[PDB]
Design a protein around this ligand. Structure first.
Ligand SMILES: CCC1=C(C)/C(=C/C2=NC(=C\c3[nH]c(/C=C4\NC(=O)[C@H](C)[C@H]4CC)c(C)c3CCC(=O)O)/C(CCC(=O)O)=C2C)NC1=O
Ligand SMILES: CCC1=C(C)/C(=C/C2=NC(=C\c3[nH]c(/C=C4\NC(=O)[C@H](C)[C@H]4CC)c(C)c3CCC(=O)O)/C(CCC(=O)O)=C2C)NC1=O
Ligand SMILES: CCC1=C(C)/C(=C/C2=NC(=C\c3[nH]c(/C=C4\NC(=O)[C@H](C)[C@H]4CC)c(C)c3CCC(=O)O)/C(CCC(=O)O)=C2C)NC1=O
Ligand SMILES: CCC1=C(C)/C(=C/C2=NC(=C\c3[nH]c(/C=C4\NC(=O)[C@H](C)[C@H]4CC)c(C)c3CCC(=O)O)/C(CCC(=O)O)=C2C)NC1=O
Ligand SMILES: CCC1=C(C)/C(=C/C2=NC(=C\c3[nH]c(/C=C4\NC(=O)[C@H](C)[C@H]4CC)c(C)c3CCC(=O)O)/C(CCC(=O)O)=C2C)NC1=O
Ligand SMILES: CCC1=C(C)/C(=C/C2=NC(=C\c3[nH]c(/C=C4\NC(=O)[C@H](C)[C@H]4CC)c(C)c3CCC(=O)O)/C(CCC(=O)O)=C2C)NC1=O
Ligand SMILES: CCC1=C(C)/C(=C/C2=NC(=C\c3[nH]c(/C=C4\NC(=O)[C@H](C)[C@H]4CC)c(C)c3CCC(=O)O)/C(CCC(=O)O)=C2C)NC1=O
Lengths: 162, 160, 35, 160, 162, 160, 162, 160, 160, 162, 162
């Protein structure tokens, strides 16, 4: 993948220039947030099951028909697939937050995911609501500083599906 | 970089990052300040390093610049020093990234086929890299000299 | 190729057993004593 | 169903159905009438089975409806009874199908992930299924009780 | 795949209802036809190679161009490919007949066959003729009652290709 | 046997036999007396079945015994009838086993290269097993004739 | 693996003769107990988890040293291996019972098991006690007629280990 | 330990330990005494941590000690507290070692199946270990409490 | 062809043609004229070869035309001789190509399944090809017949 | 992959006809030009590295932006892949010239090449310029007749890409 | 494998006891030795090529028959294997030294090494002599204090081969 350090390295290698003051300032900015990112990633890893629990509970409270007969998540198999997809989203959002870049979302999650769901019959809007539920649940646990960072990657996933 | 390597390793197993590799990322973001200072020092003194290493190499290998040599001429010597500049920039990239990965991707993979196509002798490449290592190590402090020499030795072994 | 471009078999028949770069995926090998 | 499993087994091996598979299909088709009678009996008595099974389960495992339990409260007990209704319907599907394939594909694959997500204890599922087994085979005759007990057996073993 | 019993089970699952009189009537219909289905399946399994032989002979007699030089079936390789395709068609039609549903024909056979033939250059008209040849050959072997049941699945394959 | 296949299928997925597997085993052992008396009827009719099957084989396929054919000569006809006896014994084994496995591990696996080694036409083999089917199913009762004929169907399909 | 029917088939095929009255009687004897064997296997299928739980509880109450620190069962991993071994023993005893043959145990279970346990330091005596505990727990539920036919294979496993 | 992880990595890609890894090992060994103080401080407070965590768990989950619950009774509650003592000792071991590998090798590999065999709810386990985190972190200074919270969180995630 | 085979072998190794393939191609193109004459010899007298080979085949295996044989009847005998015509044309194609690639591609890949569907005995095809080889080697003069025999030999080995 | 001889064999096989005078004329023409083809192929094989070096030098001299930062040939790996592609084009043009047919070019080179380059971002016009650079470099080494012969295959590659 | 810390971890886990004063003494001892171990490991890593240089030179000087034809070192591949084995030994001695315990050497280097060398014809005594060559070169290079520590692992490997 490509993180913020590698993003700067690539944008300066393509130009053929050495690191100037602006590049070094970007690197300083990334290194400053490193402790916050590591702390948030550890917190999310510790509480991933709880986050998926509460997010899924809220999503199926707002849209019960998904888990009722005739809903896309009505079976044990399809409910498990739902919570598996939510876990994938949480894990990859954590990866993107650690890296500080959204490249891994585009090349490991969002590559053909919209048409995958369309072919499957998966409701994309309900998936976006689930991602929003995950975001608002995670924000409380990680803290506002880490919540702001997790939000951008959650909305990147949401806009990728939407 | 270290962050990318840890994330790739965690992703290949479909799991969150373990506390050990989170500690690795913590150490990397801790060392970031001094590694930026080292890279900035190399960036500022790039012309001095390039001139010193070019002169040292051309004295050590007169055949490259002599007629019938690969770097003979104004334009070809300029190309030689421009390659040295690419590799110095790559070493700065590796220092900021915390691993030799930028160096490998940008200027190591397929280098032998490239220089074979360009009739560029690889022993000359290795000696030029070693000359730049000596010059840089001379210019910066002792503690950071080992860190810089790590990347320079990686490049020298890759070109060898 | 998902990796080094010049390791494709069409150009390089021995490219399959070539040394892995940072461009290649993760490689998982089981060296644990094979008892 | 029996036909579906036999056909997929044959197709996986690129062959026509063997004489044993055809004989098994013959037996299933012959027994379909008693299968449907059993399914009608279970379908008609669904509410009594659910009520008595819930009462027996909560008498055997009072912790579930005790404060702090997963089934504490009228709403969560209602959801528990609704799950019992799901599993009774799946049992009737399995009876008419002659196999546990509908039960497996509808309510066994990924059920542990679902109940971990819902904080639902699998042992409680096990005593709930055993209670439904007892109550339902209480209504059925011996031959019917054996076949229905086989399906409740499969469901309890899958949850356990 | 899906068969008639699983079809009833699936529709009542999506609707989330217990079985009604209509479902039991459908199941009784399948149970009534099952013994005839088993007899026909055993008959076709016994005479598979024969049925393929007369059907291919009839097709290549009606359309001698196929086997002659410049025909799509003119080679040992292409002739064997034609016979292999016909064997697949017979086996999966038997599976569909014994199941009582044509879903296996949609998934395993029909989803992709037209595009495959159009890319390969196979004449789809001649292939429908071969399927009709298998139909009328197998009808005499399975018997009139089983011929009526097998004809719908051969017609399904012919319509899927057409 | 049926029990053997059920046990292997259950063990492959590392799980106890499903109610469908138990149902098929129960139906198999329930019908033990019928298939057993069927095998007794087949085995008490060695030579009538063998001789009539050979007669129909040679009169529908005159060229096996014609000069130049596979069975031309007395000794080759004797070997033909010996193979017929082999396959009849295998059919009895499969009938008692409740499955076509004994025929497979004994007579089906490798039959094509065997008879290609012996230069034995496979259409002749399928004609012979069809004739034996007719002769054997003539003797048995209507219910048992179908059971015999299904195993003969498997053998005929397996040959060619 | 071979059951009684496959065993008599092997004997009569190597001997090269058709079935005689003695082998027919042996097949009758197997078919007679087929019903009881199927019923016992069906009972054990439900109670496998409960039987294993109660057997582990009794074995570890009689021998608490195994689970206390320094014991062979002391870890999550080694306790896992212990209960997995008991699961395997119960399942393979059920397989042998339903087959009617003890050969399946020899081919998979008992092939060098003593040497492997001694190599890994597993106490043979406590494994024997665990097998015996599974024996009474299973027998209490299967029924006396099934208890004898299951305890014969349990005794065979215990004697193979000891 | 940190040394073990660095060594197994270096062996995996098959070269001597990298200078950064040598820096990491020096940072680990230079901080060993602080880890020893942390481990001793936790050891001195075994009873308070264990009993306060158990009290918090049984306040959040009265059902576990309700009749029919898993930890109902004096002896079963004692086993509960002894399990908490096991995990506290493992956490001290991990703090001394510098990572979580002891906690994996002794307490996480196969914990799910074991508590299933004992019918012990894993949600109860995560609640208990979170309670142990809450108690133990307060006993220590901020820098040390952060490190200990890392291990407690990792164990809680492993149990869940 | 020889050229196509050499090109394919070079492409499999991703290398240009070495002197070995190049001078074997030079030899092949040098000898093309005599290959053309040999092909003309078999083409001009094809009907003689087909009729002689059919006569020899029916002498060796009269059962093919005998009642119950596959060649019984005027039409089926015509189809037999037409197949022999096909294979003679393929052999001439192989001669002009210098390789057995046309023979293999047009008449060897799938020949078993095709003649099995037609129920043609492959051994009878083998004697047919042997008779064709005898006749063709009869017509050709000296070393020429040699290479022609090779092709026929291959075809026989292909069909047996 | 078919050469001139195989092309004649196929055009005579599809008709079912035996060889006549016209086919012998065509094969005699191919045999006549075979010596020129073999000499040219050997010359190109011996001088392949020199041809690639000269043509790459000419291309990167005419379009220096390729090997400068921001060009598609700017990195060691991309430069290596560029000269690797030139080696493909030269080697396959040698194969096509030796075979006397352009089937290997539609068959192993140009199939899906436009899509591959468009996905990679490789410049098409610059690659066509490099193929010419190889054409002018190779013509001088191979002489007038062999250059006229190889020009049709190089122009085939250029037109297929363009 | 296990290092010095994990040895104390295991000794206290088997007893089930928490850490006490003696454990802290052992741990402090290892921590104190750690800086010396790290410095020696870095010295070996920097100069490992040189230790191989001198050790191989001395070994082949003492026993020139190996490199000469008919010896076990006579070919380029086999000589490379010879030097790679000494590289293995140096690397794993460094690993064991940095860990502090010899368990890794048992698990990886010496696990079936003697039998494999005997089957391959490798002379155990000559490989041992190479081991003392590396040991003495290391002792010269890293100073006597680290030499004493490295000698333990080197003679462990020597006796394992012996
Ligand atoms: C047909 C396949 C299928 C099943 C089985 C299924 C079960 C299921 N049960 C649920 C809730 C529930 N299920 C239970 C049942 C438990 N209560 C006690 O603990 C018992 C041990 C146990 C029942 C015997 C409870 C208490 C809830 C409420 C959870 C909550 O309110 O947070 C939910 C959440 C959505 C909702 O409530 O509508 C699902 C999806 N869903 C399916 O698509
Ligand atoms: C960022 C990675 C990267 C590298 C490394 C790179 C090397 C590179 N060096 C080149 C030229 C050259 N490079 C050299 C250097 C050699 N002269 C002596 O022999 C020395 C041993 C040696 C340098 C120390 C010379 C002499 C030329 C001119 C070649 C010629 O024009 O014939 C060229 C041809 C294109 C151009 O001149 O603009 C490349 C692609 N390109 C890249 O994109
Ligand atoms: C160019 C490559 C090629 C070949 C070789 C080929 C063989 C071939 N053999 C055929 C039939 C036949 N082939 C034979 C030949 C047999 N008669 C005796 O048994 C002998 C053992 C043997 C010949 C020595 C016979 C008798 C038939 C007629 C079978 C029938 O009518 O059912 C047919 C069917 C003709 C039709 O349907 O109109 C083909 C296509 N096809 C090809 O595309
Ligand atoms: C239990 C499994 C089994 C089978 C089936 C079996 C078949 C078998 N048949 C053989 C010979 C033979 N078998 C036949 C029978 C053929 N003749 C006609 O074409 C018929 C179509 C057909 C029989 C229905 C003939 C003619 C031979 C003699 C072939 C020769 O001379 O080599 C032989 C060689 C031994 C001998 O010649 O005495 C074997 C092994 N062996 C086995 O272990
Ligand atoms: C399907 C056929 C099969 C069988 C029969 C089987 C038994 C078996 N148990 C084993 C280990 C084990 N077995 C046990 C069980 C012991 N713990 C003690 O408390 C008890 C006395 C006793 C059980 C009642 C334990 C703890 C281990 C792991 C020992 C270790 O890891 O060092 C092993 C060695 C593999 C390993 O290292 O885990 C085998 C082969 N495994 C199989 O795959
Ligand atoms: C070092 C790794 C290790 C662990 C962790 C371990 C745990 C463990 N806990 C056990 C029992 C138990 N453990 C618990 C504890 C549970 N009760 C619930 O309320 C709580 C959520 C939870 C504790 C916080 C209980 C109640 C029992 C008694 C179960 C019984 O005997 O039926 C047992 C069975 C032996 C015994 O009864 O003493 C083990 C092996 N053993 C190990 O070797
Ligand atoms: C024989 C049939 C065939 C062709 C032609 C072919 C081309 C080809 N070129 C590639 C990369 C490449 N190809 C080029 C070449 C271009 N860049 C410069 O601008 C030049 C103008 C131009 C060449 C003259 C470059 C720079 C790459 C690297 C692109 C990348 O790595 O992202 C790749 C992907 C990497 C790989 O797996 O090899 C392919 C498949 N592959 C084939 O199997």
């Amino acid at each position: 993948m490509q993180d913020a350090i590698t993003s700067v390295i690539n944008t300066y290698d393509v130009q053929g220039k050495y690191f100037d003051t602006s590049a070094f300032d970007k690197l300083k900015a990334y290194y400053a947030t490193g402790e916050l990112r590591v702390r948030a990633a550890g917190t999310i890893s510790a509480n991933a099951a709880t986050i998926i629990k509460e997010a899924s509970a809220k999503l199926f409270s707002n849209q019960p028909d998904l888990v009722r007969p005739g809903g896309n998540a009505y079976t044990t198999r399809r409910y498990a697939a739902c919570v598996r997809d939510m876990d994938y989203f949480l894990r990859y959002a954590t990866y993107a937050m650690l890296a500080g870049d959204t490249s891994i979302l585009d090349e490991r999650v969002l590559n053909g995911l919209k048409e995958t769901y369309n072919s499957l019959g998966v409701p994309i809007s309900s998936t976006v609501q689930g991602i929003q539920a995950m975001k608002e649940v995670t924000g409380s646990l990680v803290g506002s500083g880490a919540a702001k960072e997790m939000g951008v990657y959650f909305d990147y996933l949401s806009s990728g599906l939407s | 970089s270290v962050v990318t390597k840890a994330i790739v390793s965690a992703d290949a197993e479909a799991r969150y990052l373990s506390p050990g590799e989170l500690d690795r990322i913590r150490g990397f973001v801790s060392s970031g300040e001094r590694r930026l200072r080292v890279a900035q020092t190399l960036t500022e003194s790039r012309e001095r390093i390039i001139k010193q290493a070019g002169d040292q190499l051309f004295q050590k290998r007169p055949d490259l610049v002599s007629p019938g040599g690969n770097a003979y001429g104004a334009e070809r010597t300029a190309s030689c020093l421009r390659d040295l500049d690419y590799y110095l920039r790559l070493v700065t990239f590796g220092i900021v990234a915390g691993d030799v990965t930028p160096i490998e991707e940008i200027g190591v993979i397929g280098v032998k086929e490239m220089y074979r196509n360009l009739e560029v002798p690889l022993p000359g490449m290795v000696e030029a890299v070693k000359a730049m290592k000596s010059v840089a190590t001379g210019l910066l402090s002792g503690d950071d000299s080992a860190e810089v020499g790590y990347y320079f030795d990686y490049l020298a072994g890759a070109l060898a | 190729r998902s990796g080094n471009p010049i390791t494709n078999e069409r150009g390089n028949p021995a490219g399959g057993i070539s040394d892995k770069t940072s461009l290649s995926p993760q490689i998982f090998k089981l060296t644990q004593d094979n008892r």
